[PDB]
């Protein structure tokens, strides 16, 4: 099926508490494979998946140099953004950047992205055509003017249509056992009374990969979205994920409720019933 590579960068200013913290992480689909942390002693880009350890010294030396270059730009950015928004030095602020590429079933470029946030809000984003920018506010328009004059989008477009897809294809080959796999969810429902007249029905999905999944409750075939508690999909720690959805129902109506599970490892969507 389709695949993607994504790098995530977080920089946090910490006034008077040292230089800003910088953390970079890389993923292929839902599997992490590299990290850089500005506060660790190594000061190197580091492997976080066994299938990336085979890369040579040129790889790790080059990845380390380029990610420190990312770090320095974000250090400059934190000062630049303070001036744009007329903010004092005392406060801590957050810059986030995410970029990467998707490939299709033919393993060729589908689309790419490069997005930037300041203090948890969209700041500037490369549009899907990879030629224009979506700027969230007046300060971001200043950045857009500067990036248009320096032709920033063309350079990112080249990386996203070239380097990005060619290394994703390499990682997909080197990590075939981890990345080219699908683990279907192991499903069940639990039942527990909360009083004499109500019960909690909880629909479980366990040990699945990749993370994308849909869990839905139906009462007599009607979706119960407004009355469902749906937790965020969570890692088990072993490279698989878990999720559940729960409803509280009147005791005796259990047979009205069904849970519906959709996941790409299931040949057909599952319905779980209480009878």
């Amino acid at each position: 099926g389709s695949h993607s590579m994504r790098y995530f960068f977080t920089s946090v200013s910490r006034p008077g508490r040292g230089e800003p913290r910088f953390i970079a992480v890389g993923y292929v689909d839902d599997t992490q494979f590299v990290r850089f942390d500005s506060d660790a002693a190594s000061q190197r880009m580091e492997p976080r998946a066994p299938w990336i350890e085979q890369e040579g010294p040129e790889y790790w030396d080059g990845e380390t140099r380029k990610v420190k270059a990312h770090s320095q730009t974000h250090r400059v950015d934190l000062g630049t953004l303070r001036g744009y928004y007329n903010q004092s030095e005392a406060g801590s602020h957050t810059v986030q950047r995410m970029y990467g590429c998707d490939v299709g079933s033919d393993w060729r470029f589908l689309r790419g992205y490069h997005q930037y946030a300041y203090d948890g809000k969209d700041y500037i984003a490369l549009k899907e055509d990879l030629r224009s920018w979506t700027a969230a506010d007046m300060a971001a328009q200043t950045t857009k003017h500067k990036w248009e004059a320096a032709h920033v989008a063309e350079q990112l477009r080249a990386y996203l249509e070239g380097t990005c897809v060619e290394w994703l294809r390499r990682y997909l080959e080197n990590g075939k056992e981890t990345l080219q796999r699908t683990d279907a969810p192991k499903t069940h429902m639990t039942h527990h009374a909360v009083s004499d007249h109500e019960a909690t029905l909880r629909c479980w999905a366990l040990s699945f990969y990749p993370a994308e999944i849909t869990l839905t409750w139906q009462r007599d075939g009607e979706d119960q979205t407004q009355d469902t508690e749906l937790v965020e999909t969570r890692p088990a720690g072993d490279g698989t994920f878990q999720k559940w959805a729960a409803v509280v129902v009147p005791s005796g109506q259990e047979q009205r409720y069904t849970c519906h599970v959709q996941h790409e490892g299931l040949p057909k969507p599952l319905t779980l019933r209480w009878e």
Partner: peptide
């Protein structure tokens, strides 16, 4: 592999 260079805002 990461991009070679990013540009300041």
């Amino acid at each position: 592999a990461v991009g070679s260079y990013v540009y300041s805002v």
